[PDB]
Write a protein that binds this DNA or RNA. Structure first.
Ligand SMILES: [K+]
Ligand SMILES: [Mg+2]
Ligand SMILES: [Zn+2]
Lengths: 47, 175, 76, 133, 59, 118
RNA sequence: GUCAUGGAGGUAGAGCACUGUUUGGACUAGCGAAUUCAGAUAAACUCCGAAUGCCAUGUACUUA
RNA sequence: UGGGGCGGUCGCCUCCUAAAGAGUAACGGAGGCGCCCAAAGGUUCCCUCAGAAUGGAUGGAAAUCAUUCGCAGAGUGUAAA
RNA sequence: CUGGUAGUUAUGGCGAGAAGGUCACACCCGUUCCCAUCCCGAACACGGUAGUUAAGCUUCUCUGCGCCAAUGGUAGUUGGGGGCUUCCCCCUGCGAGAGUAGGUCGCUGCCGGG
């Protein structure tokens, strides 16, 4: 496992940290999370 | 169709007379038929499995179901998860059609017909027949067969005792 | 000579934190446990690590549900 | 007499307060040895008593041993100090409380039975008596 | 009854080659033949060996 | 071969449903029974163990009988009207272990259209 | 502090319902696994289970 | 640290000791951890395990199928409770 | 009287023996339709009611199993006092577990129909 930072695709803010397995998920994870700056849900992508 | 009509017309009075049931509902009737292949050689070539699938889907006419292991056996070079057999169930009129085909053009067309062992009942009222060679099928040609996979033909009825099951089974052709 | 033993964990201070018939204020912890050794009753909640807590003000009552089990309730 | 396996290799020594929980009556044979006091009884003592009382009867009749050495005890050699963990197991013992019947015999007359039990009781570290069903 | 998925089987008529025994039952193959027996309907024909009518054990 | 009892497994599912849903005086529960012929509805609170309203596909009037489904809608209409007459306005629907698919769904929707608030 | 009332909690004892250890028969898949009959044993066994101690309530009595 | 040295140990979790609340020592008796999972998380709907007897081709004590008995004798990522 | 739905530590369960009815309930018949099967209208869903109490269901009778359970005695034990201290004894209060006399084939509530 490794540590991961998730970045908002509309602001560039780095709002979330999480983990993943690099062998099972070699791509960049995308999740829809709340963005505190815009105060709405936005797609977040691994840096 | 024809077998069901004949049964409901004759065997119901015949059974209600031969055993003296208080109500007609007590009459033992066929319930369902299960055809199980069984394939313990799947961990080397998986074409045996889907093979068994198509000859089942021809002999019965409907998609079988892949069954997998409930545990792991080192001796049979297995671990849990191997698809290790296929099965089919039959109910209703199509069951009667399969029964008629088996009793006319399949069981008589076997290599020999020395009856059916009357002591093979489970002790409750159900019966099991074991087909050894797959080529005995009417609609299936052995030229497209890779192995003689036997079939468990399980016949289940609502007969409380083996006696009534034997009555019904012998009444319908092959004893 | 050596023992090869000698380790233990810190005690976690489990058990009943309030008494039967005692007046209690909302949010108070009533019981600490592993598993549901005691179940939540009326006006009583179950925490994420199985802690039982009061949701209102009232008096604590330890009670017996069906033969083999227990619960605790809070009544105003 | 040794147990085939044990769950733990070390065990507390325990105590011997009170009268024996069960086994205070003759249940299989006609004659028995009863403990009047409490004592640890090892498997060497059991074996010696059994051989004496069986040899006197010339392999006639039947003998039942009503106690088993379930417990183990440990020890430390000469020259070692205190500490550094528990010692190594040595033998197996049965704690016997007062009132326990520990040997029963059958199949022989009064004289043979009583003399065999007298011969056996001299091999044991506990004070005994002879009882009849 | 899988909607469309299930394989297609049709009512077909079997004809014995020994005593010309005629039977009707479902079959997964129609053998690409035609008959006009069983007035009111038509079913395909199939040529096979002796059926239970001409069986040594059934006779 | 033992024949399964439909009512026993239905009651098992009903207990699973009742693990969460319970009727109070302010918010009574609406329970539904479906037989081979008719459909029944009760409105009940569990605090006192008393039912407060009821309707059935067996009353003398309202004889519209077309495929057991519009009958279910009629029963829902009746039970909603009676519950409103008694002052019941908010309820929790108890499907009684049945799937939310056919007659049950029609009954619930017909009750929704009238003075009931699921 | 005592009295009355209500609780949480598995020790002493006991027991064999689970888990380990274990004796004598009957029967036995094959000298010998299981089933049963009778009889034992336990800090890390429990179908049971105290006395005490503990936490509260009281408007009871006394006391600081 | 039952003189010091040699050997062993040093933080966290679970059981016994621990004397039926909580807490409780010894170079006392036993074991684990320094992670894993993109589902092995959330929710909605559905259902039930181990083993045994019997009946049946390859198949054999045990692989898949059918009936009956079966309160958990299974499972619960991993040590124990 | 019956159908639905609750409460109550199985004294309510398991087992055995019988009676009853399409008023309700169920089995049963069918798959056009909504929906469904890792396959199967078996279940789920829907559309009706020829036959039936064979089963579920309801009612009645059994202590065989299970469950509940005294009284007396005994073990243990707070406090007080002694021995000859692997432990034991005496006085006062509390008081099991096992075993037994005995109990049990349920008891209460609301609603709709006969
Ligand atoms: K002596
Ligand atoms: Mg999980
Ligand atoms: Zn943003």
């Amino acid at each position: 496992r490794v540590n991961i930072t998730l970045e908002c695709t509309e602001c560039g803010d780095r709002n979330y940290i999480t983990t993943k397995n690099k062998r099972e998920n070699p791509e960049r994870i995308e999740l829809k999370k709340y963005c505190p700056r815009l105060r709405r849900v936005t797609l977040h992508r691994e840096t | 169709n024809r077998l069901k009509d004949q049964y409901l017309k004759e065997i119901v009075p015949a059974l209600m007379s031969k055993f003296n049931y208080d109500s007609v509902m007590e009459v033992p009737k066929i319930d369902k038929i299960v055809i199980n292949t069984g394939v313990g050689d799947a961990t080397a070539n998986a074409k045996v499995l889907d093979s068994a699938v198509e000859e089942l889907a021809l002999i019965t006419g409907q998609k079988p179901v892949i069954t997998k292991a409930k545990n792991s056996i080192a001796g049979f070079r297995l671990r849990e998860g191997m698809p290790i057999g296929a099965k089919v169930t039959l109910r209703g009129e199509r069951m009667y059609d399969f029964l008629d085909k088996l009793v006319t053009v399949s069981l008589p067309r076997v290599r020999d017909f020395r009856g059916v062992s009357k002591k093979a009942f489970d002790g409750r009222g159900n019966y099991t027949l074991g087909v050894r060679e797959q080529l005995i099928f009417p609609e299936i040609d052995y030229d497209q067969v890779s192995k003689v996979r036997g079939m468990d033909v399980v016949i289940v009825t609502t007969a409380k005792s083996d006696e009534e099951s034997h009555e019904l089974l012998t009444q319908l052709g092959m004893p | 000579g050596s023992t090869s033993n000698g380790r233990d964990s810190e005690s976690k201070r489990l058990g009943a934190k309030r008494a039967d018939g005692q007046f209690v204020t909302g949010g108070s912890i009533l019981y600490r446990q592993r598993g549901t050794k005691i179940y939540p009753g009326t006006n009583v909640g179950r925490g994420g690590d199985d802690t039982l807590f009061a949701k209102t003000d009232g008096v604590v009552r330890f009670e017996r549900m069906g033969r083999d089990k227990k619960k605790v309730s809070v009544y105003p | 007499l040794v147990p085939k396996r044990v769950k733990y290799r070390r065990e507390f020594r325990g105590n011997m307060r009170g009268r024996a929980k069960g086994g205070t009556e003759v249940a299989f044979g006609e004659y028995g040895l009863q403990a009047v006091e409490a004592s640890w009884i090892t498997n060497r003592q059991i074996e010696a008593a059994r051989i004496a009382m069986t040899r006197y009867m010339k392999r006639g009749g039947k003998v039942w041993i009503k106690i088993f050495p379930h417990k183990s005890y440990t020890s430390k050699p000469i020259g070692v100090r205190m500490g550094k963990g528990k010692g190594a197991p040595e033998g197996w013992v049965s704690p016997v409380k007062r009132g326990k019947i520990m040997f029963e015999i059958a199949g022989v007359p009064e004289d043979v039975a009583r003399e065999a039990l007298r011969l056996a009781a001299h091999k044991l570290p506990v004070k005994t008596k002879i009882v009849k069903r | 009854m899988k909607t469309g998925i299930h394989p297609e089987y049709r009512p077909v008529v079997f004809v014995d080659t020994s005593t010309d025994f005629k039977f009707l039952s479902g079959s997964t193959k129609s053998s690409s033949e035609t008959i006009k027996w069983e007035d009111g309907n038509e079913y395909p024909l199939l040529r096979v060996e002796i059926s239970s009518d001409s069986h040594p054990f059934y006779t | 071969i033992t024949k399964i009892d439909k009512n026993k497994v239905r009651k098992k599912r009903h207990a699973r449903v009742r693990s969460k849903i319970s009727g109070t005086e302010s918010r009574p529960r609406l329970n539904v029974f479906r037989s081979n012929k008719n459909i029944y509805a009760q409105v009940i609170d569990d605090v006192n163990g008393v039912t407060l309203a009821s309707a059935s596909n067996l009353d003398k009037d309202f004889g519209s009988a077309e495929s057991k489904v519009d009958a279910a809608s009629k029963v829902g209409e009746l039970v909603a009207k009676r519950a409103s007459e008694k002052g019941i306005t908010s309820v929790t629907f108890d499907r009684g272990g049945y799937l939310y698919h056919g007659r049950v769904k029609a009954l619930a929707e017909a009750a929704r259209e009238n003075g009931l608030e699921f």
